[PDB]
Curated annotation (Swiss-Prot), chains A, B, C, D, E:
Domain NendoU: 206-345
Organism: Severe acute respiratory syndrome coronavirus 2 (2019-nCoV)
Domain of life according to the entry: Viruses
Marked site: Transition state stabilizer: K291
Gene: rep
Recorded consequence of changing K261R: In strain: Kappa/B.1.617.1
Residue ranges of domain Nsp15 N-terminal oligomerization in the record: 3-63
Locations listed in the record: Host cytoplasm, Host perinuclear region
Catalyzed chemical reaction(s): uridylyl-uridylyl-ribonucleotide-RNA = a 3'-end uridylyl-2',3'-cyclophospho-uridine-RNA + a 5'-end dephospho-ribonucleoside-RNA
Listed name of the protein: Uridylate-specific endoribonuclease nsp15
Length: 348, 348, 348, 348, 348
């Protein structure tokens, strides 16, 4: 017996929707849900979505609170909808998918993913929930995540990290590295070889390799010497050039992190969403060097070094396609006299 | 188990809240409540109140659908709150009272009128509901309506008309004339002898006496002759003077109705609420005669004639207090040489 | 090159979207679209929909301005979406369907109805537009309307009336009676034999037969005598019983229209949408007789007389199913000693 | 000492702003202003403007309540702002001008029209207010209205009618016909000779000449015979042609009024504002004949007959410019073999 | 061809408006602009302005992204409007000026600053844009900024810092120190001798002189001794007195910065805007010492020492006017027995 007052009761008493019985008094004013606590209104939820306030409230309350794949991965894999859960997009403060299956009466297109409406949609299945590996097996389109092996099916080892309540982390007390499976029109797909983005923050950046430790601790010309990166434009691409009005390069999160410790800078996230490649309007506070669209990718420095060293440097300009987070990311490679001039995630 | 979805189920299936079990999907957007009917949103309620949308929706759904006293009467009797019902104010599109008793968890100050919080409030009791005459006897303050006698209680015969779902009518298939009782500080108060306003509309005005039929059919000078009203300023007070820029008199609804048939006019209801005396910014469309505050009362013409003929016409100006709808309405009487010049519901 | 300013230019200069080039300055504030006309804002549209303001504005501007089937018919036929047009629902002030095909970038699920997303949806096709009869033949699900014969397709003759810009009318300068066709799962479905509702208003009701003229002019007992309706409970069903607190019968629009001329009454349309059977919370102003859910159908009196006279009157209570507006409407027939007691569109 | 609570006090006690001292409690919620009346909120104003709610409330309260020129006239004369008053536009429910002079602290550009900011603006002056004729003489740009002669200034006799609180009327108890004066760049401009629109409604249309009485009473062919209008296309232009899907002609309000009595029709006012020529999306309910943009002008039939009979009928198509309400209205005249085919207010 | 969808396309693809062709689907809900990115809504802009949402969105997209003068400077110089650009006020999240010239159709008063409407307004001209030094030369009122010299015109050297996308900085890769020119009624003004505020933050405070380094590193009595500031009330004015309930002095940002490293404190910015002098409701967390209006100015400590040492200390209380950021800032100087008691930016 689903209700606004019951969803609110669960939020107040259980921290989220937990199927518990009970009702608390609720008031809705504009885009905010309130509850009366000893005669005064306490805010429970502020609707930042394009859905009706009470509908967004129920989907947020019914969000998956287990470590789940990051929305960028699900998007890159073509996920349209989730099976009997809500993947909450914490970067957008909104549900990751428009419709639901067996979650909310206003957004449900079906109660079970076996309904014919779900057949053409890529449904997300969670092998950690009972019977979901079998629902994937019976589904025409879908993406499956598991913690262990699946009989017959060959896995694609996903990223080490997952999102737990909006916190991207590599689990120690929980499993965050999943096996990924995908089916298009009833056929189990062979997922491609892929690099993964590291999903780190600019403020809390931690190196994940000896090369990353050396980049953060060494001086620019010491690191380029140690790692034989002469002629690969790391000075421009990774370190950044703040000498002209237009900020040069600075496309790797580790380079932004190194800079951030010394001089702060403004990053305007003009398209706020989870994506493999992020675009920022950057303004360097120390120099006044700036760039309207500065594409940034967080690759492990070793993976970026491997990608750039595996390219033909004899062309003036070409598109270099790299598989990252299961999607095809186009890069722009510009060379001159056999040396790199620039390499950046292609702005389109 | 009260919920928004259950209140909505009742509205859709029963025309109002009827305590039936069930839920329909609801969406709230801004100040409107919608329900999904075959994949599309259908508006159920638009909040015109100062309460939260979902709260106003539940109080409107829980409105008393039996003939009830008109809000002006309840206001004139000092009613603060109703016992276990909602008097919906259709003139304001809002609950007639701020708080409720045993109706809605958001607006309830008490579940029963016997709670000590209700003691200082004048609670409205409906003798047609079981145990409500007893609750009135136990109440410190209150107004009671009944269809018959209550042993020991001296009754006040109320108006012939009552409001049934916003329609003011004199019942033929239902009883609309009630006995009224009031209590202030544990003590039954004797309600005063009173005139009652007729609660008629300008558009559908119907005479309720031979004098009212004669006013609408006869010419000004022959009605004044027939009813011996010479020297009582009916030409100014009732008929209206449209010869000057400021509209003269026109304080009785029957006079406005007679005028309306011949020439239309705009009545700006700048304080839209139910009241014994109504104030309008009137603009006569034929002449351009206008008045910012034109007080209008709908008294039966015979009752108005009786009031004006029961006054001493030897003073230049005095306040004449008349009990109408249980409240004391002050009129302003202006005389000259023993004749009336003007008589109007005195602007406070 | 679709834009808000171009949609607004078309509204201002052509009365609706007409594909004309040009832009006018627009301002959006809350749920209203304004345009600057000589330095002042003029309201162009007020959003009464659950869609974003600018989106609802474009769909309203792109509404079909040719006589189209009434939304009740489309709903009864299972229409989910329209092919390259917008059926505007004037009873709801909103699009009749959630999504569009080739209309607006925000609501489009496809540019053409041939896209695989449209296959499971019942798409509405208009044979008056080029290539739409063919698109219906290629559609898995759909409803087709035509002004003439389609080789091979067995037609269903629809109602005489259609909606032209919110005005329901029987065309004289335009064709409003269409041939209807339906397809479910690639298979043409034979539309059932049906009665049609007349789509008349209470305020401007006009009889459409000698029996309807006789009902409105003759007294209750002489009409029942002339048409041999003795023992069919027309006194209760059609005329209405206003003697008790609960209003008895009154389920045919013609009966409400006859009553309306003599005594006015309030009809609360608590589910405001177009439907074959309408539900109203009725309050009779003369008597105070009322009913929370009074189902009303507008059938031609001859069609209602035919339905009631074609029933077996030997059962106490049974469901009588009648096909009206292509949908199966269940009625409740209550008899006693071979005579009708009541017959009403059964409340679901 | 201007305040929201004082503006509200004036509205409640005087029907509008009257400079009286006092305060009432006010609450603002969304776009509505409320006041507490005996413990409950009563709506005083609903903001339909693009200004902040409290600002629109004060300008509406401070509206000119004397008969003023109709907004179409002021617009046609180039009025940008009013001197120390607010012309309320009742067709738009908004102030007729963006800014004020000596009215409201939020919208004031100046306290007096003598301030240099007002010099390039055409300020409206009211000769009925003390010192305003002098302020016009000192103004660089302006429009002046007077009830009599101004020594030296050559007057323009305006329309008989004016707007008194939204009611357009020809005054009997007040003066509504004004003398008009205009100044552009310090120089008095001679206002042109002009026809005036009659400002009548479709619902309450009243003839203002023997020709207008004859048009409404006589049949089409006998009116055209009596007034020698053969070959002037009155059948198309004035009467309207409802035989084809596109409604033919119907550009004079009297023709729409004659039609309205027999058959009703929908007029969609897609640009709701006061203008000399009005544009409507018309749908005829009887025939289904319709037109997206049907320009309508309310000229006295004699004035229209004079205009059409004063044209050379030897050209196929030409623009005929006529001065109406001080503005130049371009008409489109289409002839064939010396007879009129169509004549309509040319769609810009 | 300006549109909402084109402005949105530019924001998404270029980080701001760049005149690029293209359209993205947009939805407006309340005060937020969204765009569809792979079937989900992504927020592009939240309107914090008093302008319509779509209008504020276009002005924000069309903001000047080059280092521009800080809004306080432009305000102090009397700038009313900018020539063909938008100075975005990042302290208010709104345009710095009401109207625009050649930017947006809704806010434009003119397309070119040469139009007569601009003559009485102080237009801001940017010498870095072609032909703007000549538009200033031809303009009646204006402020001009240049990077280099202007023939004939003597410059006023502005502050070292400018705002680049909301980041106030002293440029190293871009020029931020401009030459200022001003014209009032066609006459090139001689701008006054002025001090400049340093525009530093409380958190990221960096000293800009040996005296400022000494203030932050030395103990109160060591610094006052070294700089011979005995008898100048630096203990009260600069350091702050936190011993009583009312916080004493603390009017210089460097003093707040020194305090902030040791003990944190709440600064309530009750008038959030850019101004030479800032007012804060300060509460010291360590002591509970507080002040409702604590005026703070960020002057270079050497400039403040120079101002205070250039005053006559023989009066009890006088207003000391100092030119800071081209405006006249009144200070209050209180002395006793030839020594300073307090000196603060005068609260009016
Ligand atoms: C405080 C400043 C303006 C210093 O330049 N900005 C930041 O510290 C910062 C860091 C990362 C992202 C974003 Cl948006 C701002
Ligand atoms: C349009 C005019 C001004 C014509 O006189 N007014 C009305 O029709 C009218 C009648 C009764 C009440 C209200 Cl408010 C307006
Ligand atoms: C004001 C009253 C209650 C008078 O009977 N009702 C109406 O005039 C009326 C008529 C038809 C429909 C609706 Cl909703 C109301
Ligand atoms: C309901 C219909 C379509 C019936 O013809 N229209 C009107 O009653 C009507 C009359 C005048 C103006 C407007 Cl907008 C509508
Ligand atoms: C966290 C506290 C409450 C500690 O006192 N405040 C701050 O750190 C702080 C600093 C500067 C300005 C503002 Cl508003 C707050």
């Amino acid at each position: 017996a689903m209700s606004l007052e019951n969803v609110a009761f669960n939020v107040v008493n259980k921290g989220h929707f937990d199927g518990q019985q009970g009702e608390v008094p609720v008031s809705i004013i504009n885009n905010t849900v309130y509850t009366k606590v000893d005669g005064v209104d306490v805010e429970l939820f502020e609707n930042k979505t394009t859905l009706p306030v009470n509908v967004a409230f129920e989907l947020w309350a019914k969000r998956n609170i287990k470590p789940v794949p990051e929305v960028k991965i699900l998007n890159n894999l073509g996920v349209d909808i989730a099976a009997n859960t809500v993947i909450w997009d914490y970067k957008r403060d909104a549900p990751a998918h428009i419709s639901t299956i067996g979650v909310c009466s206003m957004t449900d297109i079906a109660k079970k993913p076996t309904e014919t409406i779900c057949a053409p949609l890529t449904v997300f299945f969670d092998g950690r929930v009972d019977g979901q590996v079998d629902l994937f097996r019976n589904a025409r389109n879908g993406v499956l995540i598991t913690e262990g092996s699946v009989k017959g099916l060959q896995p694609s080892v996903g990223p080490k990290q997952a999102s737990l309540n909006g916190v991207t982390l590599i689990g120690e007390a929980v499993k965050t590295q999943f096996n990924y499976y995908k089916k298009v029109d009833g056929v189990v797909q062979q997922l491609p070889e892929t690099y993964f983005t590291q999903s780190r923050n600019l403020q809390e950046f931690k190196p994940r390799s000896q090369m990353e430790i050396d980049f953060l601790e060494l001086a620019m010309d010491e690191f380029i010497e140690r790692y034989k990166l002469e002629g690969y434009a790391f000075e421009h691409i990774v370190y950044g050039d703040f000498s002209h009005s237009q900020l040069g390069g600075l496309h790797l999160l580790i380079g932004l992190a190194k800079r951030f410790k010394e001089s702060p800078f403004e990053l305007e996230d003009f398209i706020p969403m989870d994506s493999t490649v992020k675009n920022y309007f950057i303004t360097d506070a120390q120099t006044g060097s700036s760039k309207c669209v500065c594409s940034v990718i967080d690759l492990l420095l070793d993976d970026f070094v491997e990608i750039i060293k595996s390219q033909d440097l004899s062309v003036v300009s070409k598109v270099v396609k790299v598989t990252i987070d299961y999607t095809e990311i186009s890069f722009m490679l510009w060379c001159k006299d056999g040396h790199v001039e620039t390499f950046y995630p292609k702005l389109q």
